[PDB]
Amino acid sequence: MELGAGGVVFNAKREVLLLRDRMGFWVFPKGHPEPGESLEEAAVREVWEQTGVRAEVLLPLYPTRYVNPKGVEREVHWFLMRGEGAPRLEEGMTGAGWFSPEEARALLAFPEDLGLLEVALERLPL
Ligand SMILES: Nc1ncnc2c1ncn2[C@@H]1O[C@H](COP(=O)(O)OP(=O)(O)OP(=O)(O)O)[C@@H](O)[C@H]1O
Ligand SMILES: [Mg+2]
């Protein structure tokens, strides 16, 4: 199992930051923690690296698990975040943008992410 850390990021319009990976799936931004890095710090770094968005962690969410196409089981720890700015897709792109809850429900490719989206929306203050 390999750890992961990501963020469910929201802007003022309460839109969520989504990315389209190599295999064509829309997901939340996340990546591998660096040695000595906490998951929260790792999550903030991964968001900035992959989208150029500077975000603030509001509170922790919960981890999701799954086995990727390479046979590696991943445990990704998530954090609710706040951020702004036009996303800048990284050279591992194909897609990115801010989406409303309803649009995100139609893009997110996995059950774990759809579930995570709702729980995040509920804890996101007004
Ligand atoms: N919740 C999920 N359930 C099932 N499959 C998923 C889930 N999330 C992602 N995947 C699949 O696994 C892939 C992502 O795996 P993973 O996060 O390990 O790789 P990565 O982020 O592309 O690269 P890396 O982790 O090596 O830096 C997706 O491209 C997709 O095919
Ligand atoms: Mg990384």
Beta-strand residue fraction: 25-35%
Q: Could you estimate the helical fraction of the residues in percent?
A: 25-40%
Termini gap: 36 Å
Indicate the CATH class.
Alpha Beta
**What integer value in Å does the Rg equal?**
13 Å
Give the SSE order as H and E letters: EEEEHEEEEHH
- Structural class computed from helices and strand pairing: alpha+beta
CATH superfamily: Nucleoside Triphosphate Pyrophosphohydrolase
Number of strands: 8
- Sheet having the most strands: 5 strands, mixed
Oligomer category: monomer
Judging from the principal axes of the Cα atoms, what is the shape? globular
Number of helix segments?
3
The overall number of domains is 1
Bound molecules: adenosine-5'-triphosphate, magnesium ion
CATH topology, by name, is: Nucleoside Triphosphate Pyrophosphohydrolase
The CATH architecture assignment turns out to be: Alpha-Beta Complex
Keywords:
three-stranded antiparallel β-sheet; binds magnesium ion; 126 residues; five-stranded mixed β-sheet; binds adenosine-5'-triphosphate; 26% helix; alpha+beta; Nucleoside Triphosphate Pyrophosphohydrolase
Please provide a written account of the structure.
One of its GO terms (biological process) is AMP biosynthetic process. Substrate binds at residues 21-23, 30-32, 66-68, 74, 112. It catalyses: P(1),P(6)-bis(5'-adenosyl) hexaphosphate + H2O = 2 ATP + 2 H(+); P(1),P(5)-bis(5'-adenosyl) pentaphosphate + H2O = ADP + ATP + 2 H(+); P(1),P(4)-bis(5'-adenosyl) tetraphosphate + H2O = AMP + ATP + 2 H(+). With 126 residues, this protein is of the alpha+beta class. The chain has one domain (3-124): Nucleoside Triphosphate Pyrophosphohydrolase (Alpha-Beta Complex), CATH 3.90.79.10. The protein is built from 3 helices and 8 strands, in the order ββββαββββαα. Strands 1, 4, 5, 6 and 7 form a 5-stranded mixed sheet that branches. The longest helix has 13 residues, at 39-51. 32% of the residues are buried. Bound molecules: adenosine-5'-triphosphate and magnesium ion. The site of adenosine-5'-triphosphate has 14 residues, from strand 6.
